[PDB]
Amino acid sequence: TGQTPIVKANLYDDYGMDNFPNGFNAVVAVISYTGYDMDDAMIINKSADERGFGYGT
Amino acid sequence: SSRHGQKGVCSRKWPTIDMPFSETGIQPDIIINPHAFPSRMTIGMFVESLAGKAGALHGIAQDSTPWIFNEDDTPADYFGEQLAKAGYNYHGNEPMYSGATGEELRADIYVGVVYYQRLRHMVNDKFQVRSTGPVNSLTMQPVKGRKRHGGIRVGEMERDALIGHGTSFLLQDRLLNSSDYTQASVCRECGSILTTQQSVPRIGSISTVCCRRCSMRFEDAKDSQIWEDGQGNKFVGGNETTTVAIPFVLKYLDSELSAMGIRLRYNVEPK
Amino acid sequence: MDISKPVGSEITSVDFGILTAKEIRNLSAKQITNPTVLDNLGHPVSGGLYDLALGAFLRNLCSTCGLDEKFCPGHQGHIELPVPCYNPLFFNQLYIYLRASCLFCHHFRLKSVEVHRYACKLRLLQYGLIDESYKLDEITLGSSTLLNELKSKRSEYVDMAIAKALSDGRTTERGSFTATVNDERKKLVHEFHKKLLSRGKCDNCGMFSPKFRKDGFTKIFETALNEKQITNNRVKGSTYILSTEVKNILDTVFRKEQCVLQYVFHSRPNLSRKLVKADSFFMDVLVVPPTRFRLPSKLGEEVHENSQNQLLSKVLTTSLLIRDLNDDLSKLQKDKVSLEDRRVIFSRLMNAFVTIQNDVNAFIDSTKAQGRVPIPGVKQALEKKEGLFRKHMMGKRVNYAARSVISPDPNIETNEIGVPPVFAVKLTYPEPVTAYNIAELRQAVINGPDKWPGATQIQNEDGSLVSLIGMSVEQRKALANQLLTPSSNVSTHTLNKKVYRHIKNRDVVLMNRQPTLHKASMMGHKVRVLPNEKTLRLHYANTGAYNADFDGDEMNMHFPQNENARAEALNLANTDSQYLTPTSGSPVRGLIQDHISAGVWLTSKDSFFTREQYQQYIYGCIRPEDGHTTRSKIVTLPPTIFKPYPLWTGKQIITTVLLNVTPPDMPGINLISKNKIKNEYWGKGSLENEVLFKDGALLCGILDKSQYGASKYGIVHSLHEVYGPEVAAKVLSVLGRLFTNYITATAFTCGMDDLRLTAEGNKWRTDILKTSVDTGREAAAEVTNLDKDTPADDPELLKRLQEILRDNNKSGILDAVTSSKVNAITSQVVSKCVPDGTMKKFPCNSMQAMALSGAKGSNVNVSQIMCLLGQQALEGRRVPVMVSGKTLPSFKPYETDAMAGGYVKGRFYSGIKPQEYYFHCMAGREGLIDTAVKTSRSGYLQRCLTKQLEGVHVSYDNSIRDADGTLVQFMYGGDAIDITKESHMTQFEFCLDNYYALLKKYNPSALIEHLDVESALKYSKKTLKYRKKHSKEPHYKQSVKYDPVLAKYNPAKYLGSVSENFQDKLESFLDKNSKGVNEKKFRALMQLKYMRSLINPGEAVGIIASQSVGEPSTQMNVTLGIPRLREIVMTASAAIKTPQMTLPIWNDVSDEQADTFCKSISKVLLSEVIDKVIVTETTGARSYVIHMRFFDNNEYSEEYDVSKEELQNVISNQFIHLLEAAIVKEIKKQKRNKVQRDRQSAIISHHRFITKYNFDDESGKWCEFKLELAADTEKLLMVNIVEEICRKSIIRQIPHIDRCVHPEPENGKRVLVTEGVNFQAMWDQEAFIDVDGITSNDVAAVLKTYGVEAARNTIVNEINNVFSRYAISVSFRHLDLIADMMTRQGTYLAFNRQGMETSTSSFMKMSYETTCQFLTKAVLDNEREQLDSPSARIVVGKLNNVGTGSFDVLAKVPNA
Amino acid sequence: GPEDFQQHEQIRRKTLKEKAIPKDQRATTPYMTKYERARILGTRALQISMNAPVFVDLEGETDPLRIAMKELAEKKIPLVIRRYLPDGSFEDWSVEELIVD
Amino acid sequence: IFVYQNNITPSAMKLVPSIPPATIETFNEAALVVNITHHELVPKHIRLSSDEKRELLKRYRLKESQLPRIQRADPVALYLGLKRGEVVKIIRKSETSGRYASYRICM
RNA sequence: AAUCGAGAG
DNA sequence: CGATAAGCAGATCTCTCGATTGCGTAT
Ligand SMILES: [Mg+2]
Ligand SMILES: [Zn+2]
Ligand SMILES: [Zn+2]
Ligand SMILES: [Zn+2]
């Protein structure tokens, strides 16, 4: 399940990239809270993961 | 990864109750550390979080094509005005509460919506563990490749690292004890690895190890030191053979040198 | 390796030799005749390559031993070559020996007495008689009878010398072979062969022998004697040679000269007494490897045949062809047949000979074949990186290892690894079952191969391997109940069963991330088994050592299998022992970014915590039930504030954390240090920049990156020093847990508010940027020397800018000047706008906070985000320019605008314009290219260094030496102290403050019964007194009445045996400050600390030095950096790219005299004084009028110190001679005032074809001279040759010196550096140059003139000042050890194959490179390597000699 | 026949006795080096794992390396270190004769 | 000790080693005007007598060949008149540990 | 098994 | 003999995938 970007270039439509979704709009908190993402790691919500966030085959 | 080269592996699936939550009630699905930005300097990701929040609030789409803003019309000002006109603040911060202690966090937290891509480099294609398995034929070392259940390689630099630590038994355990350790047989008399064989026994006798190089034919030599081959050619000769602990690539190197017409004599300690 | 199957024997050493044809046939199992391997129906053919006598093959029992494929080792076989073939390995030496003898007397063309002399010298060199070989050259001074007397005297002297050396113990019967005697033997043999090659006529018969020519291999042709040669031959009294005839020639020569060839072909005493024979150089019976080593591959249906089998079968086809064709010649000899068909069969026989020789050549080496994909030969199978040595001996694939991606885990101990449950069920460990193990080994067997902790296999006493994979619970229970049963078999009553239990939590693992640049990148970790994922979890403090980040990195995880490897990984390679790296003794572990930015918040004054918050933080970071406390009960502190309500502080949190981790009955740390955040960032009167500990209480300052992190003399480093590495590991783990639980309670974040400025800040920024409008135009006006304030559209400015564009050096000058100006503007903007122009300020401003704090980023990054990106630099210049003078299509040609040159006024907050975006992309691409080039080029240096240094270590004599015994240094760095223990030796204030804790850890009372305390101290006092009396004299004038104490007493056995630097510093400290710790007990403790800070015997110092010189080289007019390192240590180039001499100046020489001397020394060519030259050719026979127009006298006599007389002399002597030489060579190539009158006459007479000459002797302005050629001469340009001559002709040049520049004096002393090296030229200039301080750059030149030790000093200095510009701190012990390895033979040996030739171990060089050549030289000399270098033992499979192999272990059995 | 072996054995014993450094004049470090400590622990652990007699009180322990560490703490390891000089001459220090760290 | 102003002919170079045990050494008037042992980089070399040379060798259990080597043609070796086989003691000024004594052997 | 191409750190 | 101008030689981390691998011929 891809999504169209909220922030996109005007040329996103001109090449019809909506025919080929590439990602998903995610709620991203820039926060040092977990301790498990310092060098370059990132944390994904478990519940969002169980709701099909970023699923593929 | 975001659309700003902020790649990173997923380190934990944080449970939603333990996730921080905002005054609105929402809990972010992605957490990115603030320390990813000061050296990478991806301010586009900041302004994209700002514009994405404003767009998802006003039900609009914002364009991000470069060189539409300038230093007199800053995207920070633009999307901040759009955020202020909706009830959120100018700078995109939100009052969040710790999900473990329930207290409000020390400062407002920068949140927003950014577009995220899932790359094809899954961990299910990268993990590999070997205890024992198939080996190469001419070296008896583990085969190569994850798809064949083959071991990983301890190269020259890893060998130097093991020597630098002074860990001699570590180097032995890596390069010998768990790669191609074989208990070969060496003729004590001539010191050749591969000129020996097991003898074909008679009825009720026991096979022995005997050297071909250090044995003369029974015919040429005009009951204990007589041994037989499969062909029946009797021999009376070298029974001064022992057992050592060598690699197997050593034996292959011995064969490749014999093909060159070069002999190697190995002197054993107890004679 | 199974620890229950001991091996009694052991390979002591190996000896190289030749496999003779007789023994090959003696040991063989079958001869291979038909070049068919398999018949129809897929079966081997008898006599073929896959014969059953060569080993089992695809379910066929081997016919030699009668065992199946699994248990058949393989058996050798041979094929019979009809004609002897040249062994391609030995072809060069055989050819040399062939073209050195005389075909008549069958001796060498050299004199027999000289041959005997060389035989005697080599027989001496076979023993420890290195100097008798040179004492044998005096026997000459003291015809046939005289020569017999001389040879008898030489033999008598040699026998006497060898007998004496044997009898007095200087050598044994097996000889004394070392690197220096190997070098001398190699030199003697090389000169012997050269002397054999330098002959034209035999000295014992005078009869000329035909020459030989070499088209390559497989062939040899002898030129027939000349007419003049046969002329002398009779008075004395193209042709193709055959393999048998050359075998006969060399057999005769060797039979005659066996006496000298025995000592040429043996580097040790030939105790075998077996003769040296020529047929060893000839292959007549090839050996076929067993079918086991020649099996065919089967990749599904594609079943190709072995390439070795293919080459052997090609040899067999040629052999059968030549055998059959040999029977035809039998028909044309018994029967009288005309010699036509005899000619045909003879030509075909020659073809067969050459073809079989080429077949053997291609079977052994691909390159020695002929023809124009190829099947690799045996030499090709081992030669290179993809060969056999580097891919299957030095490196190997391994069992019980795993690989996965790494993810972070702050809740894992800093000395641990997070092991996924998927690995924990596949990795096992053999566990012998005892009476103390059955409790849990039985449970593992019941759990089975799936439920962790479980067991996958049971190894019985008799070696049976019962697998538990396919069994049920009741079966596993029966097996677990019969686990520890008493053995019924007598042969195995000493053994117990082994359980292959799963990897538990008490196991240790070896972790490694490629590329392994240093040993810290491979450490031991305690396995902690996790339940969820399939990645390895790593603590953050290991990222500094592994250079690892969690963005896709994967790293290996090796599981040691025996108790010895377990103990090594737990105690020697464990990660808590690697707190400091040996490169410079700096720490490599510590928390990184979120923990640093959390500590800045938690340890500020604004942090107060109620009783609940305080106790929760303390318990969360401590958790005493896991061994974290040292009191079994948490101890807290009274609150800072008692009323109105109890409030603690974060500094109190730190204090109680220390109080709970630091052991009791030991004082607290007393550290005074700083941190990265200035006091001005906290407001007026603050003192938070000054960290302070007192009795273990944090009382001032904030903990930072300077405290916990990769920082020296912080709290974690000081805790390390005072409490051991284990306590510092606990502190790192506890601090990581503390700042993590704190970061969830009070989160940390960054946003757009942190990136903004104020209205006043933006106003300042734009006002200062407005000043950058005219900077580019002013820089252009001043580089072009135009008047300032000239308009940007001035025609002269545009012209000069175009000249500057065309000329690269002028363009670089303009770029550098304008870059400096715009950098000044950038600095002004940044200083005015940060932090005084930022709306949100530290500590609230998180961007600024973590840039100041060292968590991540820097002031440059903050400046670019908030103020200015600044000038973009390509390599070291501005942006590239087109050929039209445009730097981009937008900018007009030759625009003097800073933005045009790449100076971007934009910032990453407000965004950058299109042109600025383009320039920034240029710079970013350049960086991305440079990083790849750098990582590509780094590693060859480290490999080459480590190959030779891999064996040198510390011996129990405390001297460091190579594994062959060759002493390299008598002391490690001259002091024997470990670099990883050197950090706090000189920290005397710290040691005095922590005296009581240091004394508690050192415990002199239990270390006195095995010590000597008086002698070393007395000698040290005497030597210090003498030095104080004599330390005002030059280094050469001093006497050595009292040597340094380390030279006499063992510093690890005699307290007080310390260095002169350490002792001087300690006494200066005790003198300058007096402080109740007694001044005697403090010196005693410092001496005991020195005694305990010594490098242990068995330390791989060579490996460590190579790693610490190579790994820092990743972070990289005169050559700089890695190219310089290549020049110094890799190449040892005598032809240094930029030779230089530093010339000190006497203090009484002024600047004007300095410049006068510089111009006097610097060279001037004729081209540097001539403006133009006019050539006026006339055909009125053909003549030239060459007019040379010079610069004015008042110009060149001032600038170059050149006079009219000197110029005229140069033109009269050298220029015209060179010009005429060039003219006559050109023609040869084409044929394919009476003083002036007398000067002209003399020039005409001396020179070839000059007809006029006049020099302006009154102005020094011109020089016109005619030049008349012949009429046959073709037209010449006569200007290109004149220019070439004028350039190549000097005026006043000192050899090897181009320029002498007087730079700005630095650090006081005034220097004078030339662009070349000529020591003796300035040896004369005593007046201007202090010759005693002339230090150069070329290591070879100083070796020539001053000696080995000055070369060693300059090696250290040059290999050090490369790291000085890169600000990379490398200790001088590594550089000194490398210098002493490079100058060990008294010369400048490089770290490469040519610089390693004279080494005792051949396996080391064979593994390194040119495996073929080093094997040929090893077998020709019958070298017997004793398996001492680390490479040799890895080849053979013996425990190494460095480290835990430096000794042996004996068991004290009670009863005899 | 056998007398050749007797001569070889005599020579081997004589060279061994010549290489050994007598206790009264060994000039090596009194302290046990880290490498020696690690190998003593590993070898003693191997011996315990192969059912050797143990000279310490097992506090219900199962790790052979931990048992060896306990023995080293109480100085009950019946082992001897044979330190090798570069020339092949050697000294013999018992485990209890050395001071750890 | 023999010296020569400009050059020494090859014809006169084959007699300097021709009369043992007397040793003849050759030098130039140029290339000598500066004493190399006065250069600060060149350390102090002291020729070691055989009595203490045997003591050094027995202390370190060495052969003569296993020492660091100084070339017979090394300028300091010519200065010292070093015969082959006799060791030279070098007092090296170390940046780390000050004065420590190193040893080379002429060979 | 090579060769080519795509990648990861 | 010898001093260059010239010729020839061997060098210049680890891991995961996929795709292809040889044409003419004489009987
Ligand atoms: Mg990485
Ligand atoms: Zn044999
Ligand atoms: Zn067989
Ligand atoms: Zn002759």
DSSP class per residue in C402-428? EEEEEEE-TTS-TTEEEE-HHHHTT-E
- Selected for mutation to probe chain B from C2, C3, C7, C9 (highest B CB count within 10 Å) is C9
Torsion of CA C466, C468, C472, C476, to 10 degrees: 70
The length of chain D is 101
* Common-topology check for domains C400-426+504-578 and C427-503: no
CA–CA distance, B163 with C1434 (Å, rounded to integer)? 11
- Selected for mutation to probe chain E from C968, C1035, C1344 (highest E CB count within 10 Å) is C1035
Q: Which of residues 13-52 of A touch B (CB under 8 A)?
A: 22-34, 36-38, 40-49
Report the amino acid identity of residue B104.
E
At CA C822, angle to CA C820 and CA C826, rounded to 5?
Answer: 110
CA–CA distance, C443 with C448 (Å, rounded to integer)? 9
CA–CA distance, C838 with C845 (Å, rounded to integer)? 9
Ligand found nearest the CA of B240: 2
Report the amino acid identity of residue C789.
D
**Could you give the angle at which helices C339-364 and C307-334 cross, rounded to 10 degrees?**
160
CA–CA distance, C109 with C822 (Å, rounded to integer)? 77
CA–CA distance, B50 with E2 (Å, rounded to integer)? 91
Binding residues of C for Mg(2+) are 549, 551, 553
Q: By C-alpha distance, which of C529, C570, C586 is closest to C983?
A: C586
Query: Where in the sequence is the domain holding D44, given as residue range(s)?
Result: 16-101
Contacts 24+ apart (CB under 8 A), C797-801: C797/C894, C797/C896, C798/C893, C798/C894, C801/C885, C801/C894, C801/C896
At CA C615, angle to CA C614 and CA C618, rounded to 5?
Answer: 90
CA neighbours closer than 13 Å in the CB half-sphere of residue B235: 28
Contact between the CB of B144 and strand G at under 7 Å: yes
D1 belongs to a structural domain: no
CA–CA distance, C1164 with C1157 (Å, rounded to integer)? 14
Ligand found nearest the CA of C55: 3
Q: By C-alpha distance, which of C1319, C1283, C1289, C1328 is closest to C1163?
A: C1289
CATH number of the domain at B135-270, please?
Answer: 3.90.1800.10
Residue C241 Cα, ligand 4 centroid: separation in angstroms?
A: 19
Residue appearing with tokens 């001469």 = C1273
- Using the CA of C198, give the nucleotide whose C1' is nearest: G1
CA–CA distance, C1274 with C902 (Å, rounded to integer)? 55
CA–CA distance, C835 with C831 (Å, rounded to integer)? 8
Report the amino acid identity of residue C807.
D
What's phi and psi for C561, nearest 5 deg?
-110, -15
CA–CA distance, C1325 with C1300 (Å, rounded to integer)? 14
CA–CA distance, C365 with C61 (Å, rounded to integer)? 33
Architecture of domain C427-503: 2-Layer Sandwich (3.30)
CA–CA distance, C33 with C51 (Å, rounded to integer)? 11
**Does C542 lie at the interface with A, CB-CB under 8 angstroms?**
no
CA–CA distance, C276 with C859 (Å, rounded to integer)? 75
Give the SS3 label for residue C680: helix
Query: Secondary structure of B20-32 in the HEC alphabet?
Result: CEECCCCCCCEEE
Q: By C-alpha distance, which of C1337, C1335, C1342, C1346 is closest to C1309?
A: C1335
**Cβ-Cβ contacts under 8 Å, C951 against chain D:** none
DSSP class per residue in C785-832? TPPTT--TT-HHHHHHHHHHHHSHHHHHHHHHHHHHHHHHHHHHHHHH
CB atoms within 5 A of ion ligand 4 belong to C 102, 105, 202, 205
CA–CA distance, C465 with C1274 (Å, rounded to integer)? 95
How remote is the C-alpha of B97 from its chain's centroid? 40
Q: Which residues touch strand F (CB under 7 A)?
A: B 7, 121, 136, 144; C 297, 299, 302, 386, 514-515, 548-549, 551-553
Q: Which of residues 37-66 of D touch C (CB under 8 A)?
A: 37-43, 45-51, 58, 61-65
CA–CA distance, B164 with B156 (Å, rounded to integer)? 12
**Cβ-Cβ contacts under 8 Å, B62 against chain A:** 6-7
CA–CA distance, C1324 with C687 (Å, rounded to integer)? 60
CA–CA distance, C527 with C506 (Å, rounded to integer)? 7
Could you say which DSSP state residue B142 is in? B
- Cα–Cα distances (Å) from C42 to C39, C46, C57, C59, C306, in that order, read 6, 13, 11, 12, 15
Per-residue exposure over C1173-1186, b if at least 16 CB sit within 10 Å of its own CB, e if not = bebebeeeebbbeb
CA–CA distance, C572 with C118 (Å, rounded to integer)? 52
Binding residues of C for Zn(2+) are 62, 65, 72, 75, 102, 105, 202, 205
What's phi and psi for C1364, nearest 5 deg?
-75, -40
Check: CB of residue C476 under 8 Å from CB of residue C468.
yes
Check: CB of residue B120 under 8 Å from CB of residue A31.
no
Q: Which of residues 140-199 of B touch A (CB under 8 A)?
A: none
Question: Which domain CATH number covers D85?
Answer: 3.90.940.10
Q: Which residues pair with C1264 in a beta bridge?
A: C1187, C1254
D52 belongs to a structural domain: yes
Check: CB of residue E106 under 8 Å from CB of residue E84.
yes
Architecture of domain C400-426+504-578: Beta Barrel (2.40)
CA–CA distance, C449 with C453 (Å, rounded to integer)? 9
- Using the CA of C554, give the nucleotide whose C1' is nearest: F9
D8 belongs to a structural domain: no
The length of chain A is 57
Check: CB of residue C102 under 8 Å from CB of residue C109.
yes
**Does B44 lie at the interface with A, CB-CB under 8 angstroms?**
no
Could you say which DSSP state residue C193 is in? H
The length of chain E is 107
Q: Which secondary structure element, helix H or strand E, spans residue C508, and what is its range?
A: strand C508-512
Q: Which residues pair with C459 in a beta bridge?
A: C465, C498
Distance from the A15 Cα atom to the nearest Cα atom in chain B, whole angstroms: 14
How remote is the C-alpha of B247 from its chain's centroid? 24
* Protein residue with the closest CA to the C1' atom of nucleotide F8: C552
Chains contacting D (3 or more CB pairs within 8 Å): B, C, E
Q: Which residues pair with C698 in a beta bridge?
A: C693
CA–CA distance, E92 with E94 (Å, rounded to integer)? 6
D69 belongs to a structural domain: yes
Contact between the CB of C392 and strand G at under 7 Å: no
Could you say which DSSP state residue E36 is in? G
- Using the CA of C515, give the nucleotide whose C1' is nearest: G13
CA–CA distance, C32 with A41 (Å, rounded to integer)? 64
What's phi and psi for C749, nearest 5 deg?
-155, 165
Chains contacting A (3 or more CB pairs within 8 Å): B, C
Check: CB of residue B268 under 8 Å from CB of residue C16.
no
**Could you give the angle at which helices C1280-1288 and C1216-1230 cross, rounded to 10 degrees?**
140
C1090: left (phi over 0), alpha (psi -120 to 50) or beta: alpha
Could you say which DSSP state residue C211 is in? -
How remote is the C-alpha of C1315 from its chain's centroid? 29
Check: CB of residue C1340 under 8 Å from CB of residue C1352.
no
Check: CB of residue C568 under 8 Å from CB of residue C436.
no
Residue appearing with tokens 């100046």 = C1145
CA–CA distance, C1228 with C1218 (Å, rounded to integer)? 15
Query: Secondary structure of C712-760 in the HEC alphabet?
Result: CCCHHHHHHHHHHHHHHHHHHHHHHHHHHHHHHHCCEECCHHHHCCCHH
Torsion of CA C684, C690, C691, C694, to 10 degrees: -100
Residue appearing with tokens 């000790």 = E1
Q: By C-alpha distance, which of C199, C206, C212 is closest to C231?
A: C206
* Protein residue with the closest CA to the C1' atom of nucleotide G12: C940
CA–CA distance, C457 with C469 (Å, rounded to integer)? 8
Going by their DSSP bridges, the two strands B62-63 and A7-8 should be labelled as parallel
Q: By C-alpha distance, which of C1041, C1044, C1335 is closest to E93?
A: C1044
CATH number of the domain at C579-749, please?
Answer: 1.10.274.100
Could you say which DSSP state residue C217 is in? S
- Cα–Cα distances (Å) from C398 to B136, C394, C417, C810, C1001, in that order, read 12, 12, 20, 59, 41
Record the resolution, in angstroms: 2.7
Binding residues of C are 62, 65, 72, 75, 102, 105, 202, 205, 549, 551, 553
Token digits of residue B43: 């301010």
Q: By C-alpha distance, which of B144, B115, B139, B254 is closest to B194?
A: B254
Check: CB of residue C460 under 8 Å from CB of residue C484.
no
First to last CA, chain B: 67
C106: left (phi over 0), alpha (psi -120 to 50) or beta: left
Evaluate the omega torsion of the peptide bond into residue C639 and state whether it is cis, within 30 degrees of 0.
no
Q: CB C961 to CB E70 under 8 A?
A: no
Token digits of residue B145: 């490749």
D55 belongs to a structural domain: yes
**Does B169 lie at the interface with D, CB-CB under 8 angstroms?**
yes
Going by their DSSP bridges, the two strands B153-154 and B109-110 should be labelled as unpaired
Token digits of residue C78: 């041979």
- Those residues whose C-beta lies under 8 Å from the C-beta of residue C962, and which sit 6 or more positions away, are C179, C951, C952, C968, C1102, C1429
Using the Cα atoms of residue C1408, residue C1410, residue C1414 and residue C1419 in order, give the sign of their dihedral. Answer: positive
Q: CB B50 to CB C748 under 8 A?
A: no
G strand bases under 7 Å from protein CB: 1, 10-18, 21
**Could you give the angle at which helices C1101-1110 and C914-949 cross, rounded to 10 degrees?**
160
DSSP class per residue in C892-938? PTT---TTTTTEE--BTTTB--HHHHHHHHHHHHHHHHHHHHHHHHH
Report the amino acid identity of residue B179.
S
* Protein residue with the closest CA to the C1' atom of nucleotide G9: C1410
Number of domains in chain D: 1
Question: Is chain A adjacent to chain C, meaning 3+ CB pairs within 8 angstroms?
Answer: yes
Q: CB B32 to CB A29 under 8 A?
A: yes
First to last CA, chain E: 21
CATH number of the domain at C976-1096, please?
Answer: 1.10.357.120
Going by their DSSP bridges, the two strands B21-22 and B128-130 should be labelled as unpaired
CA–CA distance, B270 with C4 (Å, rounded to integer)? 21
Residue B270 Cα, ligand 2 centroid: separation in angstroms?
A: 15
Question: Which domain CATH number covers E103?
Answer: 3.90.940.20
Q: Which of residues 54-73 of E touch D (CB under 8 A)?
A: 60-62, 66
Q: Which residues pair with D32 in a beta bridge?
A: D100
Check: CB of residue C1351 under 8 Å from CB of residue E68.
no
Query: Secondary structure of C83-141 in the HEC alphabet?
Result: EEEECCCCHHHHHHHHCCECCCCCCECCCHHHHHHHHHHHHHHCCCCCCHHHHCCCCCC
CA–CA distance, E71 with E58 (Å, rounded to integer)? 23
Check: CB of residue E90 under 8 Å from CB of residue C1360.
no
Can you give the distance from the CA of residue C760 to the C1' of nucleotide G14 in angstroms?
54
E85: left (phi over 0), alpha (psi -120 to 50) or beta: left
Q: Which residues pair with B115 in a beta bridge?
A: A25
Where helices occur in chain B by DSSP H, the ranges are 37-40, 43-58, 75-84, 156-164, 168-172, 249-259
Ligand found nearest the CA of C29: 3
Q: CB B127 to CB C404 under 8 A?
A: yes
Chain E residue at shortest CA distance from D89: E61
Q: Which residues pair with B181 in a beta bridge?
A: none
CA neighbours closer than 13 Å in the CB half-sphere of residue C1345: 27
CA–CA distance, C994 with C1009 (Å, rounded to integer)? 25
Going by their DSSP bridges, the two strands C536-538 and C416-419 should be labelled as antiparallel
